[PDB]
């Protein structure tokens, strides 16, 4: 599995996200509860967690391969992702394989992504 | 299943994007120039243009397989995503494999993704 060649623009520092209570938060200030509340109000969307099992360098430049356990039943998915790709980790906040690189592209502060990190995402119900 | 980078960025709905020049634009109001006008601005930022070479349905319902020619060297890359995944197309704007579904989920006007479409984004030089 190979990730989309493009990243969503809202990762840029200073970008504003629209929260479910009508709230607007700067992308760097996002919290887990923001995802939770946004999914809760939305009839269309639900929250989904993916635990990181393994992290490894790819054969392609600026790309790392990450094994995820996706959702309930822990579905096994390996994806080639850019080392700069920010993930939002449960109880942690923004995390990428190359935080310093994320700081260059999006100027987004990131923890180092590690095994055991639970990545939260918005998904369909 | 689908790993976090594969999933559509549903939290981009109603977002306000911060451009590299310091300008602000609502996500639905983004233009191709905004990617290009921000291309020359810094040293690290660069425009990655991935041309869709193929669009095929997948055995998985509501999922499409897209082949891209990626970057300057035109690397062949196959990506499996939900049909409503937004891409920003050169001279077109927001597009996906299911414009109607993208419009409902992301609350934006959406065109149809085509084998001619050039998908653009911000990557590193």
Distance, in Å, from the CA atom of B61 to the CA atom of A93, rounded to the nearest integer, reads 32
Across B89-106, b (16+ Cβ under 10 Å) vs e yields: bbebbbbbbbbebbeebb
Please return the burial class of B35, using the count of CB atoms within 10 Å of its CB with bins 0-12, 13-18 and 19+.
Answer: buried
Residue A92, chain B, CB below 8 Å: the answer is: no
- The Cβ-side half-sphere exposure at A101, using a 13 Å CA radius, reads 18
Given resolution (angstroms): 2.5
Both structure tokens of A55: 């992290």
Radius of gyration of chain B (CA): 14
Our CA-based measurement puts residue B9 at a distance from the nearest CA of chain A, in whole angstroms, of 7
Q: Which residue of B has its CA nearest to A43?
A: B105
Both structure tokens of A2: 């190979």
Residue A16, chain B, CB below 8 Å: the answer is: yes
For residues B3 and A120, the answer to whether their CB atoms sit within 8 Å is no
Residues of B in contact with A13 (CB under 8 A): 18
Residues of A in contact with B67 (CB under 8 A): none
Distance, in Å, from the CA atom of B117 to the CA atom of A2, rounded to the nearest integer, reads 19
Residue B106, chain A, CB below 8 Å: the answer is: no
Residues of A in contact with B2 (CB under 8 A): 70, 77
Residues of A in contact with B86 (CB under 8 A): 8
Which residue pairs, CB below 8 angstroms and at least 24 apart, start in A58-64?
Answer: A60/B75, A62/A101, A62/B124, A64/A97, A64/A98
Q: For B44, which of A13, A62, A104 is closest by C-beta distance? A: A104
Q: Do B12 and A12 touch (CB under 8 A)?
A: no
Distance, in Å, from the CA atom of B84 to the CA atom of B102, rounded to the nearest integer, reads 5
3-class secondary structure for A6-72?
Answer: CCCHHHCCCCEEECCCCCEEEHHHCCHHHHHHHHHHCCCEEEEEEEEEEEEECCCCCEEEEEEEECC
Report how far apart the first and last C-alpha atoms of chain A are (Å, whole number): 23
Residues of B in contact with A81 (CB under 8 A): 3, 5
Q: Do B124 and A66 touch (CB under 8 A)?
A: no
Region of residue A100 (left: phi > 0; alpha: psi -120 to 50; beta: else) = alpha
List the determination method. X-ray
Residue B27, chain A, CB below 8 Å: the answer is: yes
Torsion of CA A20, B93, A6, A28, to 10 degrees: -30
Residue in this structure with the two tokens 């369909």, named with its chain if needed: A124
């Amino acid at each position: 599995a190979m990730a989309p060649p493009t990243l969503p623009p809202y990762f840029m520092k200073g970008s504003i996200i629209q929260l479910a209570n009508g709230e607007l938060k700067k992308v760097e200030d996002l919290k887990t509860e923001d995802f939770i509340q946004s999914a809760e109000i939305s009839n269309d969307l639900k929250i989904d967690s993916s635990t990181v099992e393994r992290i490894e360098d790819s054969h392609s430049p600026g790309v790392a391969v990450i094994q995820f356990a996706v959702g309930e039943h822990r579905a096994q998915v390996s994806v080639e992702v850019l080392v700069e790709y920010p993930f939002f980790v449960f109880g942690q906040g923004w995390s990428s394989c190359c935080p310093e690189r994320t700081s260059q592209l999006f100027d987004l502060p990131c923890s180092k992504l590690s095994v055991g990190d639970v990545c939260i995402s918005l998904t369909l119900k």
